[PDB]
């Protein structure tokens, strides 16, 4: 990748020991946290971050971080996306607030219902939705619709996609092209043969013998790979897509958790595509945990002949889907604020214009030191690869990731008031990030490299 | 089942056009929703309370709520237990408030975890704990780490259990005693006879005959369940169970979702259970969508040894689990505040006897009318059941369950100022619960089944 690796491992040694001088009340607190969480934090991935322990913040606030040690961070992780458009948005928090003291959860819907459902259905263009407690759940749950409406087994997926934990999911392949599971994802007593067909991102004569099968309820995908690397989709790729996926009667899901950084409508508005289904996480609840989905009128109409609109005195049934705290008066007040207050236009052209900045500003020093890599950005979202050249799928892309290199980076950054997200070579803008801000990183980053070249 | 379905029917009919007369704003709403929800409300379980729509509600206070058509309700229904301790809190909704105006989901920890890490170990026995977004992933999460850590592929459910939308665990028994998939629950393309074994609660011989197979990882189960109606365990059943598993080297799943009515600590920690795991669902985070899961450290050992503590510049994984804001600020604050504030030995005192209240106005109504149903009561939870004597098993509770008259029930209350949840025939009291709330509750119920006797 350009790097010697012994130098990266010298200076990462370095950064380590740099971490537990600057951090020793968060390593403290790791300690004490150890005793309780099975993995020393409330999630297991919260262990992955670089430096002997995850920070514990003090406060957050747009896009700064102060944690327990005294240290301040610009934050270009954003809660791993969870927080896209900064932390505690005023309007967002005072609606959270205002809700809580007037009923949480109650199993019905009050006002905001109303404006958030024709909001989502003019925003998105998809007439019918539905909200559950995490964008895995809208997956799920529109699979199971997409089984039920087609009397079909197999979902397809692309090559090191990520979607949540969709266990039919959970498939790369190997070295002779076999369709195996996910390095590191047992299988959990599936047979990934009988539930999933494994295709390569930017291959439409693959995704035509997977469908050609059928077998396919439906075909998941981002549309614009985001979580192994960014994989973006090659010209004549969505509308093959849709054209195979209509000729073959198959379901179209086009999950956005991600790809809604790249405007106020989703890559599918404004790029014109066509899902079936549409899928949207968390970030628009403002720290609930959340998500939406929608479908077509056409969808609409198949789901209601199999699953009719509920009679009175009918034996009450969940039918697989649901959560009893899905579609909560919390969650659909947070989204009111944050779709009417948050997601305009003005805040993606403040979030456009430091994400370039950003990106050119990365591109400009991988330039300069003749790295064999390059950046990418979707909308608000920068990332970068150890590759010369954007990846064609994303079989390709995780051949240019490597978690010293990455860990080196995040730990430098981390260790001089930057963060970034652990699980990626990301940076994404938000409404309160300033110019001081991405050239911080832009600085920071060039120090890095220089000192590992 | 002791009343005339006519009769029933008839009963049901004026009061479908009561609701009607009562409730026009909600039902104009409905309308409105029905454009853009696929069920009309944001989740599709909310189609199914009694009447032509579900109310819209405009505030909820304690036991309070009131509707946008200004009726003022007593409720028992308590978002379906997601609120069992009282609607906005205000410990917990002061608690909400403040983290939303610090950072929601950082991906990281905060003082919070510290303490409510440390508070889950000492209120519930088991050493090591996770956050989920739902008790559903939480069941989920644990059953893919017993797989992994046993290399056993199957989960032993009881029949007529509920657990989430946990599809391993949708069968049931049909009348030739196979093992099917639940009644209205798609299979998914899960083939359940690779995935579970089904037995009877109350049945150690049946229990005994399925892990002899040597493929079960795991048993889940509530400790009394509570989603068929009432099934309490047999005297020795909780020994039985706990010997076997042990026996087998079986995980014993203990999910609390619904028992912690039953005190501070649970069923388990009333009657000295020695789960393996234990699951408590959203109770907890006031209106966050939120659970956790302990276990043990005989359990964090083995699981330790197969999904190892993250080392440093390792592959980033999230190995099938976990979920972006699983674990978040928001969810620790509010479950710091109700573990400090809410659930207390008192705050359960009173609710123990406002419910011991409720249990001996219905039994004395039952036993008044001369009804073939009985009540049965678990700390703060009260619920009847159509048959005369308590079921032996779930298999034998399904049977005592009738959509019409439960609804005609439900919907007479309903226009008389008491919410119930539409999904089962219990009350739940809350601290805010007072005895005059619980004399509506006895009267109307008395003169409903009156009016069809
Ligand atoms: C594209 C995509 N879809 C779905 C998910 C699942 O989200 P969650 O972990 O909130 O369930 C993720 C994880 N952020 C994602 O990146
Ligand atoms: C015993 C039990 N376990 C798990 C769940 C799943 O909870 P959720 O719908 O919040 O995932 C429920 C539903 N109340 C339950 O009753």
Same mark, same amino acid.
Not at 363 to 381: C, F, N, S
Not at 421 to 449: G, I, K, Q
């Given at each position: ?13 370095? *950064? ?22 099975? +993995?020393?934090? @409330? ?10 322990? @995850? ?72 007439? +019918? ?16 619709? =997409? ?11 692309? %090559? =090191? %996609? ?9 498939? *790369? &392949?190997?070295?002779? /092209? ?29 995704? *035509? ?12 995908? $981002? @549309? ?11 010209? !004549? ?29 989703? +890559? ?8 079936? &289904?549409?899928?949207? /996480?968390?970030?628009? #609840? ?18 209601? #002949?199999?699953?009719?609109? &509920? ?10 889907? !649901? ?21 305009? $236009? ?12 950003? *990106? ?6 991988? $330039?300069?030191?003749?790295? @064999? ?10 990332? +970068? ?16 990731? %490597? /978690? ?22 990301? #940076?994404?803008? =938000? ?19 220089? $000192?590992?070249?």
């Amino acid at each position: 990748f350009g790097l010697d690796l012994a130098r990266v491992e010298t200076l990462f040694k370095r *950064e380590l020991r740099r971490f537990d001088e600057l951090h020793p009340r968060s390593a403290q607190a790791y300690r004490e946290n150890r005793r309780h969480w099975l +993995y020393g934090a @409330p999630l297991h991935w919260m262990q992955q971050w670089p430096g002997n322990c @995850p920070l514990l913040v003090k406060e957050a606030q747009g896009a700064r971080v102060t944690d327990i040690d005294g240290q301040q961070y610009v934050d270009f992780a954003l809660g791993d996306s969870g927080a896209m458009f900064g932390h505690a948005q005023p309007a967002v928090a005072d609606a959270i607030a205002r809700q809580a003291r007037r009923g949480s959860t109650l199993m019905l819907p009050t006002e905001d219902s109303l404006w958030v459902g024709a909001e989502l259905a003019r925003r998105f263009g998809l007439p +019918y939705w539905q909200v559950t407690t995490s964008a895995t759940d809208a997956n799920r749950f529109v699979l199971r619709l =997409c089984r039920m409406l087609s009397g079909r087994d197999k979902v397809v997926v692309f %090559n =090191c %996609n990520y979607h949540g934990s969709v266990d039919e999911s959970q498939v *790369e &392949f190997d070295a002779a /092209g076999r369709m195996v599971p996910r390095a590191g994802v047992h299988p959990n007593g599936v047979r990934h043969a009988t539930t999933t067909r494994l295709v390569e991102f930017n291959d439409l004569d693959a995704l *035509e013998a997977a469908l050609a099968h059928g077998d396919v309820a439906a075909v998941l995908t $981002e @549309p614009f790979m985001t979580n192994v690397g960014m994989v973006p989709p090659a010209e !004549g790729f969505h509308a093959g897509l849709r054209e195979l996926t209509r000729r073959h009667d198959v379901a179209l899901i086009i999950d956005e958790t991600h790809t809604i950084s790249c405007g106020p409508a989703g +890559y599918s508005g404004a790029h014109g595509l066509e899902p079936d &289904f549409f899928v949207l /996480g968390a970030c628009i #609840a403002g720290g609930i945990p959340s998500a939406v989905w929608g479908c077509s009128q056409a969808q609409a109409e198949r789901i209601w #002949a199999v699953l009719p609109h &509920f009679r009175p005195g009918q034996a009450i049934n969940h039918f697989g889907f !649901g959560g009893t705290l899905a579609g909560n008066a919390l969650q659909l007040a947070a989204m009111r604020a944050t779709f009417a207050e948050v997601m305009t $236009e003005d805040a993606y052209r403040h979030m456009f214009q430091l994400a370039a900045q950003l *990106e050119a500003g990365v591109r400009a020093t991988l $330039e300069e030191l003749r790295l @064999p890599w390059h950046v990418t950005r979707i909308g608000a979202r920068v990332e +970068y690869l150890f590759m010369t050249h954007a990846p064609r799928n994303g079989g390709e892309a995780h051949h240019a990731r %490597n /978690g010293l290199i990455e860990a080196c980076l995040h730990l430098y950054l981390l260790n001089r008031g930057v963060l970034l997200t652990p699980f990626h070579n990301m #940076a994404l803008t =938000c409404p309160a990030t300033r110019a001081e801000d991405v050239e911080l990183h832009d600085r920071l980053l060039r120090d890095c490299l220089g $000192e590992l070249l």
